[PDB]
Design a protein around this ligand. Structure first.
Ligand code: J1V
Ligand code: MG
Ligand code: MG
Ligand code: MG
Ligand code: ZN
Length: 889
């Protein structure tokens, strides 16, 4: 198994200048003819010409129109085509080939494949070599001239990159289109689509050059009424890059295309972005609320790649975070501006500190720029994406908006049209840093450690106040735990956005201040501080770290009520909950271990409960924020703080704490549930797809959160509310009615009702599957068996399989059944999936990522299933590599 090392990068001995393709789609096969106009590079040392080419059937290959013969002049082993150097020309030459591929049976969804009745490609990272021979690496930039031919009735719409320059008829009911794309690009940005596509379109006029851009959004005919919001999002994305970054789209046309079968969310192929239908299509009757932020995020993300990834591309795959971390950061800026809700940033943080922090303390921990890989398909991680985003966001925090924008533009202007590395970005940022500091000696060399050092830093605090001196000090320490990547961890450049709150009136005591912690510890002193403050630390979550605020719960409550920063308010709440969780967890654990007949539990802080009530009852407070404060921290966040976590004991702990709070606040919850109804469920704009109200969707989130709390609580006659909720036109509401009815005898009545509402829309049915999967049912295993037999069957659609199984894996009490039966079930699904889609099989391993954090019995049970999966004779490269790393072999 070949290991690629970052330090081993070297330019190719060859150059590919022009790609001319003919892709002829037929019923049982697709024939790909390719002529590569090539040259010898300055780095060439007379080596064999080796092309990537995976699973290609060779019809013929030639050099300069002379047919090559197998054995004598080349070898092919289904992975590499080797042309022996004595047969490789010493100057410019043409290499040509004709191969046969089979998209109909390509269930791995990489390369060229068939998704229902649409032919579609996915080439990132190294999928182009599944279509034709190539030196398949992103520094091999070339011009593309692409002809696609197909049956006209089945495939009337033909798309590839660049301008459509010809369309023609072919005998026998066939037709062709030629696409010429003169600007250089890496092969992972090649795409082709063929199908009976329907569309919406619009014309966008750019801000400065006033170029007309044609925008097209495509789907299968059945779902063409779900395209409107995507088109609106694309317009919004274009405006935001213009307005914030001064960047205009450079091409005549941009196509977005939804397909049903897709391994991830979407892909930024130049001028031809291809989407998982679940991240492009929605309508108010047939989509839950989360679809709208999703589509906004994913359309924006792919659009922002046109600069950060497409126009400035990657030297090599170890630079992945340079385009993905930066594009997630650009998408987050965009979505924060579009939604105007604080819950947008909080949701990002919530995901990072649960999913990505778990990854970074697991055996899979890696820096955002890894030193090696075996599988590229395993490289696309929350570390590279989401910690990468936070590392890209810290530059903005450090520089401020004006100098950040200046540094970003330096980056774009210097590297436009070229490959680039992480150093190129740090360099641009450093030039702005020198400007901001008015100091040509300032540098960001330490900052590069964010790219190379793995693990989550821990930042802790001590405080001191001298009332006579009016002098306040914040002593700060950072620590990263050693791991398999670095034995000795170095201090990072950590920006700490801080405020100082006057506890008597809740007001700010200093101006905006970002502490630059660059040592293992430092002491920051403030003069003329008139009263002892409560510090507001890491405002906006200003670094991707574990924060240990060393505040009392009284101080945390004061911040929760009166601080100006949404994240510190949310974090102060989080920290109050975590202190309670850890305390009750240990009390339950001791009672379990000692077999106690009687014991005591520490009650929830009553002033905390009063504070929650205070915020809930404040009309001027934000509904999305309110839904967070009544929610305990994510299980995957909690597990980072507990060794040998007994999931039953954690389930008992959560249940006690929710019951404590509900016993005081349920009447408040119910009153709000009823009073929110009019605004939350307003139907005024239900048949307008252009009109999206993120505050209103947050009101529904709050209403559905409260209803869940009230249902679990068996609040008197709440089932009446549940039944009425099932009649709401909004899927977020009527699917919520199904999941909260789990606690009542009406569950299967609502199961059938909502199934009937869901079954005729592909994406809605997947949302219904998730709702069932996540239902808090004692008979959930029997229910999953019913989904398998009656709905899922042998679907190879990743959306179907992920919907049925992933939500269930978050069922703390049942997935982690001490028998190991949940582990056994997901491992069977992983092995089954691995036969046809290794990338999705590795996604389905997600619940095993925390295996060594659980109690000893469940560690053993998980490890047994992983070892069983590893012993499968037909295990894929992807899955084997992943499980070997996860189990520390
Ligand atoms: O879809 C996602 N990411 C893709 C991306 O960055 N789009 O711009 C993404 C695209 C392609 C791949 C990918 C797909 C493959 F089939 C494959 F083999 C591969 F190696 C990578 C992984 C992630 C996300 C994370 C960004 C927002 C949507 C969910
Ligand atoms: Mg093949
Ligand atoms: Mg404008
Ligand atoms: Mg289907
Ligand atoms: Zn991306």
């Amino acid at each position: 198994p070949k290991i690629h090392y970052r330090k081993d990068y070297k330019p190719s001995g060859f150059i590919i200048n022009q790609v001319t393709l003919n892709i002829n789609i037929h019923d049982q096969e697709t024939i790909v003819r390719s002529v590569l106009d090539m040259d010898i590079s300055k780095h060439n040392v007379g080596e064999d010409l080796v092309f990537d080419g995976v699973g290609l059937k060779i019809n013929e290959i030639s050099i300069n129109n002379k047919k090559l013969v197998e054995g004598e002049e080349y070898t092919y082993d289904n992975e590499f085509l080797t042309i022996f150097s004595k047969f490789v020309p010493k100057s410019k030459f043409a290499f040509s080939s004709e191969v046969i591929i089979h998209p109909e049976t390509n269930y791995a969804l990489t390369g060229l494949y068939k998704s229902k009745n649409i032919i579609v490609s996915q080439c990132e990272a190294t999928g182009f070599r599944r279509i034709t021979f190539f030196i398949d690496r992103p520094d091999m930039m070339a011009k593309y001239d692409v002809t696609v031919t197909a049956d006209k009735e089945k495939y009337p719409v033909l798309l590839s990159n660049g301008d459509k320059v010809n369309e023609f008829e072919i005998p026998g009911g066939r037709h062709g289109a030629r696409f010429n794309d003169p600007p250089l690009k890496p092969c992972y940005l090649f795409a082709v689509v063929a199908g009976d596509l329907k569309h919406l379109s619009a014309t966008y006029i750019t801000k400065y050059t006033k170029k007309k851009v044609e925008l097209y959004v495509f789907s299968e005919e059945k779902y063409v009424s779900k395209l409107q919001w995507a088109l609106e999002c694309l317009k919004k994305s274009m405006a935001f890059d213009e307005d914030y970054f001064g960047l205009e789209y450079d091409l005549s046309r941009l196509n977005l295309v939804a397909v049903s079968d897709f391994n991830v969310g979407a892909m930024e192929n130049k001028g031809l972005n291809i989407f998982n239908a679940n991240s492009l299509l929605a309508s108010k009757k047939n989509s839950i609320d989360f679809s709208y932020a999703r589509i906004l995020t994913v359309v924006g993300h792919e659009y922002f790649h046109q600069y950060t990834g497409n126009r400035v591309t990657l030297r090599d795959w170890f630079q992945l975070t340079l385009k993905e971390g930066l594009t997630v950061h650009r998408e987050n800026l965009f979505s924060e501006e579009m939604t105007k809700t604080v819950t947008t940033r909080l949701s990002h943080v919530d995901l990072l500190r649960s999913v990505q922090f778990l990854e970074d303390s697991s055996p899979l921990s890696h820096p955002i720029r890894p030193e090696s890989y075996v599988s590229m398909e395993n490289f696309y991680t929350t570390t590279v994406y989401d910690k990468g985003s936070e590392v890209m966001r810290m530059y903005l925090t450090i520089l401020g908006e004006e100098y950040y924008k200046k540094g970003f533009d330096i980056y774009i202007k210097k590297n436009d049209g070229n490959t680039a590395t992480c150093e190129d970005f740090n360099y641009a940022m450093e030039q702005a840093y020198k400007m901001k500091k008015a100091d040509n000696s300032a540098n960001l060399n330490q900052y590069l450690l964010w790219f190379s050092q793995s693990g989550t830093p821990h930042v802790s605090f001590k405080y001191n106040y001298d009332a006579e001196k009016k002098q306040y000090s914040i002593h700060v320490n950072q620590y990263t735990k050693p791991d398999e990547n670095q034995k000795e961890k170095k201090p990072l450049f950590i920006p700490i956005s801080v405020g100082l709150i006057n506890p008597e009136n809740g007001k700010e005591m200093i101006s905006q201040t970002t502490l630059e912690l660059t040592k293992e510890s430092d002491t920051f002193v403030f003069n003329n501080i008139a009263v002892k403050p409560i510090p507001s630390l890491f405002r906006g979550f200003s670094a991707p770290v574990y924060i240990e605020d060393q505040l009392t719960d009284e101080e945390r409550i004061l911040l929760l009520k009166y601080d100006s920063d949404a994240f510190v308010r949310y974090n102060s709440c989080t920290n109050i909950y975590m202190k309670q969780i850890l305390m009750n967890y240990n009390e339950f654990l001791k009672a379990k271990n000692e077999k106690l007949e009687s014991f005591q539990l520490t009650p929830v802080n009553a002033q905390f409960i009063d504070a929650i009530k205070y915020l809930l009852e404040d009309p001027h407070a934000d509904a999305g924020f309110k839904s967070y404060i009544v929610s305990l921290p994510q299980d995957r966040y909690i597990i980072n703080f507990v060794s040998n976590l007994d999931t039953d004991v954690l389930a008992d702990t959560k249940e006690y704490i929710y019951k404590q709070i509900g016993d005081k606040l349920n009447d408040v919850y119910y009153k709000m549930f009823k009073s929110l109804e009019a605004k939350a469920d307003d139907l005024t704009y239900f048949n307008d797809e252009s009109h999206v109200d993120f505050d209103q969707m947050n009101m529904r989130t709050l209403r559905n959160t409260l209803l869940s709390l009230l249902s679990k609580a068996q609040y008197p006659n709440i089932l009446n509310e549940i039944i009425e909720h099932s009649k709401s036109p909004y899927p977020s509401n009527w699917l919520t009615s199904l999941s909260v009815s789990a606690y009542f005898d009406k569950y299967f009545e609502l199961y059938d009702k909502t199934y009937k509402l869901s079954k005729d829309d592909e994406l809605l049915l997947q949302e219904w599957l998730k709702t069932v999967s996540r239902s808090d049912r004692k008979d959930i295993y029997e229910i999953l068996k019913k989904l398998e037999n009656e709905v899922l069957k042998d679907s190879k659609n990743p959306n179907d399989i992920r919907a049925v199984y992933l939500p269930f894996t978050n069922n703390l009490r049942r997935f982690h059944d001490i028998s190991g039966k949940g582990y056994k079930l997901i491992a069977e699904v992983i092995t089954k999936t691995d036969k046809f889609n290794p990338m999705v099989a590795t996604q389905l391993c997600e619940p095993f990522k925390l295996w060594n954090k659980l109690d000893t019995k469940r560690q053993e049970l998980m490890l047994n299933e992983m070892n069983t999966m590893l012993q499968e004779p037909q295990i894929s490269n992807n899955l084997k590599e992943y499980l070997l790393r996860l189990t520390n072999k």
